[PDB]
Scaffold this motif. Structure first.
Motif, PDB file in Angstrom:
ATOM      1  N   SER A  64     -30.194 113.434  53.838  1.00 47.05           N
ATOM      2  CA  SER A  64     -29.888 113.612  55.251  1.00 47.05           C
ATOM      3  C   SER A  64     -31.175 113.555  56.064  1.00 47.05           C
ATOM      4  O   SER A  64     -32.251 113.882  55.563  1.00 47.05           O
ATOM      5  CB  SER A  64     -29.163 114.936  55.492  1.00 47.05           C
ATOM      6  N   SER A  65     -31.065 113.133  57.317  1.00 46.50           N
ATOM      7  CA  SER A  65     -32.236 112.986  58.167  1.00 46.50           C
ATOM      8  C   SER A  65     -32.615 114.296  58.837  1.00 46.50           C
ATOM      9  O   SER A  65     -31.806 115.221  58.924  1.00 46.50           O
ATOM     10  CB  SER A  65     -31.992 111.920  59.235  1.00 46.50           C
ATOM     11  N   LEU A  66     -33.858 114.366  59.302  1.00 44.25           N
ATOM     12  CA  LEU A  66     -34.300 115.447  60.170  1.00 44.25           C
ATOM     13  C   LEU A  66     -33.466 115.427  61.444  1.00 44.25           C
ATOM     14  O   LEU A  66     -33.040 114.362  61.888  1.00 44.25           O
ATOM     15  CB  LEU A  66     -35.789 115.306  60.495  1.00 44.25           C
TER      16      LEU A  66
ATOM     17  N   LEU B 295     -35.357 107.360  56.417  1.00 41.78           N
ATOM     18  CA  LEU B 295     -35.722 108.276  57.500  1.00 41.78           C
ATOM     19  C   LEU B 295     -34.590 108.481  58.502  1.00 41.78           C
ATOM     20  O   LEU B 295     -34.450 109.560  59.078  1.00 41.78           O
ATOM     21  CB  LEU B 295     -36.959 107.768  58.239  1.00 41.78           C
ATOM     22  N   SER B 296     -33.795 107.438  58.713  1.00 43.82           N
ATOM     23  CA  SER B 296     -32.696 107.501  59.670  1.00 43.82           C
ATOM     24  C   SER B 296     -31.591 108.435  59.192  1.00 43.82           C
ATOM     25  O   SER B 296     -30.935 109.097  59.997  1.00 43.82           O
ATOM     26  CB  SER B 296     -32.123 106.107  59.914  1.00 43.82           C
ATOM     27  N   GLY B 297     -31.395 108.480  57.877  1.00 42.51           N
ATOM     28  CA  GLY B 297     -30.332 109.272  57.288  1.00 42.51           C
ATOM     29  C   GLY B 297     -29.450 108.437  56.380  1.00 42.51           C
ATOM     30  O   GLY B 297     -28.714 107.566  56.844  1.00 42.51           O
TER      31      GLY B 297
ATOM     32  N   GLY C 275     -32.502 114.964  64.942  1.00 40.82           N
ATOM     33  CA  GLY C 275     -33.065 114.263  66.080  1.00 40.82           C
ATOM     34  C   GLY C 275     -33.694 112.942  65.686  1.00 40.82           C
ATOM     35  O   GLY C 275     -34.231 112.226  66.532  1.00 40.82           O
ATOM     36  N   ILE C 276     -33.628 112.613  64.400  1.00 37.48           N
ATOM     37  CA  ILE C 276     -34.197 111.362  63.914  1.00 37.48           C
ATOM     38  C   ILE C 276     -33.109 110.372  63.506  1.00 37.48           C
ATOM     39  O   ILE C 276     -32.408 110.573  62.515  1.00 37.48           O
ATOM     40  CB  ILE C 276     -35.140 111.596  62.720  1.00 37.48           C
ATOM     41  N   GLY C 277     -32.974 109.305  64.285  1.00 43.39           N
ATOM     42  CA  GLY C 277     -32.040 108.236  63.982  1.00 43.39           C
ATOM     43  C   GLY C 277     -32.785 106.946  63.697  1.00 43.39           C
ATOM     44  O   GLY C 277     -33.965 106.973  63.348  1.00 43.39           O
ATOM     45  N   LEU C 278     -32.103 105.816  63.846  1.00 43.65           N
ATOM     46  CA  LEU C 278     -32.719 104.519  63.588  1.00 43.65           C
ATOM     47  C   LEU C 278     -33.852 104.208  64.559  1.00 43.65           C
ATOM     48  O   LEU C 278     -34.898 103.704  64.153  1.00 43.65           O
ATOM     49  CB  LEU C 278     -31.672 103.409  63.649  1.00 43.65           C
TER      50      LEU C 278
HETATM   51 NA    NA Z   1     -30.078 110.697  61.624  1.00 38.06          NA
END
Ligand code: NA
Length: 348
Positions: free
Chosen positions: A227-229, A220-222, A231-234
């Motif tokens: 690749s992530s959405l 989910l983080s990327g 605005g979505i990081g860890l």
């Molecule tokens: Na990300």
DNA sequence: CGCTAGTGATA
DNA sequence: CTCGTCACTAGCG
């Protein structure tokens, strides 16, 4: 791979020395040593001028591990997964560009920039890796060329008890479910160890310390498989995983905009790509050194069809996979470039 | 104000 | 002819 993963879970990191694994077996993601060792002799490889400093580098680390009485197993990457072809081709084009510009557009006048571009156009070939393999075997050290990505092979070696730790710089190893990973090791054996069980020491992590949930967080983080959405990081991934109770990850990803209070429209391809990413982390093909055959990282579950997992690597005959693992068969042309035999000198 | 993602310096 | 990474921060919600 997973950006900022090491800093996110630094609480679970423990500074160690290689002595801790004396009389034990450790697997090494050799590509990091090969790359950092090739950076020194960049212009040599850029000009096409013969050189083998990286060999002495890798063998320096190997001789260190040996001097501290550890049995090292060198691992190399093999074929490229179909979910990465165009990316590797992109990096290929980038290296071609940096080489062309760094050469022709910087052959006269500017020199520092030419070297700064030549160090970017550095490509680690399997020939160089084969030199490293020859040297390591000449020093009695076992080698193994993964059928595909090295991180899966290493994760298998660790999860099967064949090795006790994995020396690498890649943070993705944790998402594969490794037990012990030694990061940032220098010449003397000073590195950061991260154990799976110790993931609970991260308060920020919460109840996302289980292998499955941690993997979902990493994806989910990327990651490299997806690749992530935007605005979505860890932090956000960890949060949405902590909040949601529903075991089904699909519905969670569908309500990712609900759990995070931010306007997110999940693309149609993202769910399938998520399932593909997770399936790649779980069932990527690796080489069993003992059984001398090609097996998945984990045994398939009851709700998965092997015929639909081509993106996690395709099967070949075990004899061909064996010849690839020994570094005898070239990755691309499948031609026999060497005749090393483990019988007439692991793999037992 | 926490957090993501991009940049610049760097070997 | 195989994968960068880290400190700093603009700028987002
Ligand atoms: Na990300």
């Amino acid at each position: 791979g997973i950006q900022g993963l090491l800093q996110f879970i630094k609480e679970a990191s423990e500074p160690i020395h290689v002595r801790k694994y004396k009389g034990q077996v450790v697997a090494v993601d050799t590509y990091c040593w090969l790359h950092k060792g090739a950076i020194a002799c960049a212009e040599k490889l850029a000009k096409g001028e013969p050189t083998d400093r990286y060999v002495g580098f890798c063998m320096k680390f190997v001789n260190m591990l040996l001097s501290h009485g550890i049995k090292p197993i060198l691992v190399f990457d093999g074929c490229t997964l179909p979910s990465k072809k165009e990316v590797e081709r992109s990096r290929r084009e980038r290296r071609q560009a940096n080489l062309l510009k760094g050469k022709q557009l910087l052959r006269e006048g500017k020199v520092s920039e030419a070297r700064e571009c030549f160090t970017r156009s550095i490509n680690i070939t399997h020939a160089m890796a084969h030199k490293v393999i020859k040297a390591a075997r000449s020093q009695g050290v076992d080698c193994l060329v993964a059928p595909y990505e090295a991180d899966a092979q290493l994760a298998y070696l660790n999860k099967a008890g064949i090795v006790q730790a994995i020396i690498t710089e890649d943070s993705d190893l944790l998402a594969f479910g490794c037990k012990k990973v030694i990061l940032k090791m220098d010449q003397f054996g000073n590195g950061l160890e991260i154990d799976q069980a110790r993931l609970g020491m991260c308060r920020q992590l919460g109840d996302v310390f289980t292998e499955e949930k941690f993997r979902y967080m990493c994806i989910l983080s990327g990651c490299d498989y997806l690749s992530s959405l935007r605005g979505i990081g860890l932090a956000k991934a960890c949060k949405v995983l902590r909040l949601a109770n529903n075991p089904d990850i699909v519905k969670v990803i569908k309500k990712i905009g609900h759990y995070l209070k931010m306007n997110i429209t999940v693309p149609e391809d993202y769910i399938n790509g998520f399932i593909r990413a997770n399936n790649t982390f779980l069932y990527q093909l690796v080489f069993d050194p003992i059984k001398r055959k090609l097996i998945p990282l984990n045994a398939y579950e009851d709700d998965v069809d092997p015929e639909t997992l081509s993106y996690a690597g395709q099967y070949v005959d075990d004899s061909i996979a064996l010849q690839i693992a020994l570094g005898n068969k070239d990755i691309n042309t499948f031609e026999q470039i060497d005749d090393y035999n483990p019988d007439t000198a692991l793999y037992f």
